[PDB]
């Protein structure tokens, strides 16, 4: 297109929500071609990040770790405002792996506090696909310090399987997952810092071990578990976009499959099915489809059952209606 | 179906064989749906490891590490009895990422030492699947322990490649990649404890390093070396099931390939094809399917090459029949 | 028949450095050949990193990684493989592409003052790892560099799932190299006399799982600066990327892998659209990308502790026109 028949396409502001929540869309596309509009400003604040008062000075798009889940449809653009306030003591700057050139927009979003910036892209590409931050020379420390999110491309048409078949879901939820590289003192506590600076030094150090000190989702231990579980009842189709900017993961619903499973997060390449445990690679977004079919509590993992367990990959889905005792039941209870 | 449906079905009771072997199955389905029964006593016993003497307290499903392949067609109901004696010291479950509910079947199965329970689940997907220990709390220990096995669900009408053409191996073996997290004292050296429980604290703080001290096949470094090489000839056909309940791997076969792999396990999802080398992400089954075409000595392994060859992740397969110099031929021997 | 491999064509052809790739057609240009390589086998201290850290490497025809090699489905690989009697250890070679005797490792162990000719069909399509693999000494010889790849084109050239042709521009092989470089107590990495004298303290970093380094082309900064990888805007470039000891997760930061055989081997159909790929350790895979955007490109590792921090980050320099359609400023950097 000219910049003319850009210039002439309609607009729609978008408003975001906080993971694991998505803003609200239509999958298949309402209309033709347009200029999707979003705002982010970014906050650096301490987050805490377990229940010993483990603290990270976060890079937090929209206020939240991870960044919201943006949502348009292929050959749609995205112009998103990126906002860096003069409360912050940092430059930063986005890359969309959605996109196409300067570095993913890394080239052309470079902000000081006090300043801000407008890119537009074009999705040209159907699929989930993670941004994050990248300032030449620190790049690996802002994704760290949870700099990064996603976005889905939906192509036009809405999803379909394999064969073509539409896949239609009742719900989406979005889980990031974040490797954090906590510094120590000689007695194993974590070190507790008044500037993003002043941890620098002490987090490169860690991050050379390769061995993140947590390992969570949307933030903290805990955070998609408890009050924050994510619901489900039985028949429901569900949509699960899970990120990972630097690490590998390997995520598992507990009690349950990917059905559909995107692994690359690509809408092109043909969902694998049946899944058990999926496999997405740090710089990736993948996506799994659902039919819930028992009630109950299900665990949602990063199955390196270590990762889950004791550094924090753990999330929890509520699920209500009526037990299955054909797909499991308990012919004889625990008993002497 | 119904409760009388089901019980209307025939029972097969089916003894297991110890890994890597298989209990003898069919791999066209005989008749309709079946109820497979299965038992398994877990045994907590110590298993040394390695050639120095190492030690480990393992949770053996069945006395053995991995747990034994089940093996059922898909639609089939897997009827286990599991039972806990009262020798251990231990509460104990199993989670079937072939199942669906109850988180596997764990919510359903929690035994004390001197309980067991009866657990039937349709196998309602066709795959290779992981089975694992996992007790509320202290889930990890128990599977990197060797608290983990896997099934195979086969379609009734047997294994085909990804555009029809039937697959019939001529014999199975299964691999179980077991993780562990061996602590040391300040020698270096491995330590050894009376009960389960004193390692716990321990052990859990190897697990945090997410650096294995040995990572074997068939519970030891070389157990399926010497005379305990797996076997075949020129011209046969076999598949070997690969499971790594808690960590990924990279299975080769050094000197071959495999023809078709399912990678990810599901064979709904269409195998990938002249693989050098494949791989299964942690908390999930694969499988490989290989014509033998050249006699000798093969090794198969993690192809992390330290892994493989410092941690334990080796084994052999001695190979029967006549040399195909076509395939490849040494012009000029090692010479001056 | 047995006449008929003896009547096969033999060519010679000469190899060179990576990341480039030697003389081949994408189409098999006639029938089956025997194609003839020599490779050299070099023990010597490179320096991997900007503080002069050294490693006695293994190199094959002189470089890490080696050089890569290009044949056609049901082609025969012919390679002499000599090992100079300056050198110290005893090498050999398996490749991954091969069917038989450990991949040719068991009948190419060569002394120093040895050489050894080793024939192979490839009959399998892709692009596949080799390495050195001395019995007992297996890890130490491929992390010392010891491995590179060959790329066992179809007879027909590349493809897309749906059968239409996939033509390149140019071709860029890298190989992507764990280093573990022993440390003293001070933190300062350690130099040694002769390449033995390394093996404990090296095996001992291995145990870690945790590379100090992680490299392309066999050392920090390889490809970059003026020695980054080119192209220009609606050029087809494929990228060949080999790991033969641990996993890695590719990726074209401002770009995509548009066809991307993750698990190297053609007969399985490419993924598409990809943002970052997985190619196991002991694999090669294989990414196809058309140019859209001029500009400096950095292609890395995406755990980017591993890209930025450990050394696995290379740059493509690309020429041509911006095009603001794909993406534009609107409102630059401003107070
Ligand atoms: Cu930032
Ligand atoms: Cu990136
Ligand atoms: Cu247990
Ligand atoms: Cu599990
Ligand atoms: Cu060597
Ligand atoms: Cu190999």
Same mark, same amino acid.
């Given at each position: @297109?000219?910049?003319?028949?850009? @210039?002439?396409?309609?607009?729609?502001?978008?408003?975001?929500?906080?993971?694991?929540?998505?803003?609200?869309?239509?999958?298949?596309?309402?209309?033709?071609?347009?200029?999707?509009?979003?705002?982010?400003?970014?906050?650096?604040?301490?987050?805490?990040?377990?229940?010993?008062?483990?603290?990270?000075?976060?890079?937090?798009?929209? *206020?939240?770790?991870?960044?919201?889940?943006?949502?348009?449809?292929?050959?749609?653009?995205?112009?998103? +405002?990126?906002?860096?306030?003069? +409360? !912050?003591?940092?430059?930063?700057?986005?890359?969309?792996?959605?996109?196409?050139?300067?570095?993913?927009?890394?080239?052309?979003?470079?902000?000081?506090?006090?300043?801000?910036?407008?890119?537009?892209?074009?999705?040209?590409?159907? *699929?989930?696909?993670?941004?994050?931050?990248?300032?030449? #020379?620190?790049?690996?420390?802002?994704?760290?310090?949870?700099?990064?999110?996603?976005?889905?491309?939906?192509?036009?048409?809405?999803?379909?399987?394999?064969?073509?078949?539409?896949?239609?879901?009742?719900?989406?939820?979005?889980?990031?997952?974040?490797?954090? /590289?906590?510094?120590?003192?000689?007695?194993?506590?974590? $070190?507790? /810092?008044?500037?993003?600076?002043?941890?620098?030094?002490?987090?490169?150090?860690?991050?050379?071990?390769?061995?993140?000190?947590?390992?969570?989702? !949307?933030?903290?231990?805990?955070?998609?578990?408890?009050?924050? @579980?994510?619901?489900?009842?039985? *028949?429901?189709?569900?949509?699960?976009?899970?990120?990972?900017? !630097?690490?590998?993961?390997?995520?598992?619903?507990?009690?349950?499959?990917?059905?559909?499973?995107?692994?690359?997060?690509?809408? !092109?390449?043909?969902?694998?099915?049946?899944?058990?445990?999926?496999?997405?690679? *740090? #710089?990736?977004?993948?996506?799994?489809?659902?039919?819930?079919?028992?009630?109950?509590?299900?665990?949602?993992?990063?199955?390196?059952?270590?990762?889950?367990?004791?550094?924090?990959? @753990?999330?929890?889905? $509520?699920?209500?209606?009526?037990?299955?005792?054909?797909?499991?039941?308990?012919?004889?209870?625990?008993?002497?």
């Amino acid at each position: @297109a000219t910049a003319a028949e850009i @210039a002439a396409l309609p607009r729609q502001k978008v408003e975001l929500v906080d993971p694991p929540f998505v803003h609200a869309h239509s999958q298949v596309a309402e209309g033709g071609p347009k200029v999707v509009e979003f705002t982010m400003v970014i906050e650096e604040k301490k987050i805490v990040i377990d229940d010993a008062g483990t603290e990270v000075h976060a890079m937090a798009f929209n *206020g939240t770790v991870p960044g919201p889940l943006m949502v348009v449809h292929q050959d749609d653009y995205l112009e998103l +405002t990126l906002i860096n306030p003069e +409360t !912050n003591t940092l430059m930063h700057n986005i890359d969309f792996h959605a996109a196409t050139g300067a570095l993913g927009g890394g080239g052309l979003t470079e902000i000081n506090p006090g300043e801000k910036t407008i890119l537009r892209f074009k999705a040209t590409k159907p *699929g989930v696909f993670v941004y994050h931050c990248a300032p030449p #020379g620190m790049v690996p420390w802002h994704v760290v310090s949870g700099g990064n999110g996603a976005i889905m491309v939906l192509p036009r048409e809405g999803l379909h399987d394999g064969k073509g078949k539409a896949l239609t879901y009742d719900k989406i939820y979005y889980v990031g997952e974040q490797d954090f /590289y906590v510094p120590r003192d000689e007695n194993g506590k974590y $070190k507790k /810092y008044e500037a993003p600076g002043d941890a620098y030094e002490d987090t490169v150090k860690v991050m050379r071990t390769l061995t993140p000190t947590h390992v969570v989702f !949307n933030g903290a231990v805990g955070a998609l578990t408890g009050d924050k @579980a994510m619901t489900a009842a039985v *028949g429901e189709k569900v949509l699960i976009v899970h990120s990972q900017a !630097n690490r590998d993961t390997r995520p598992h619903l507990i009690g349950g499959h990917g059905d559909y499973v995107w692994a690359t997060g690509k809408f !092109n390449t043909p969902p694998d099915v049946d899944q058990e445990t999926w496999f997405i690679p *740090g #710089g990736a977004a993948g996506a799994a489809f659902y039919t819930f079919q028992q009630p109950g509590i299900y665990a949602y993992v990063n199955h390196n059952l270590i990762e889950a367990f004791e550094l924090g990959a @753990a999330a929890h889905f $509520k699920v209500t209606g009526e037990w299955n005792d054909d797909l499991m039941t308990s012919v004889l209870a625990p008993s002497g």
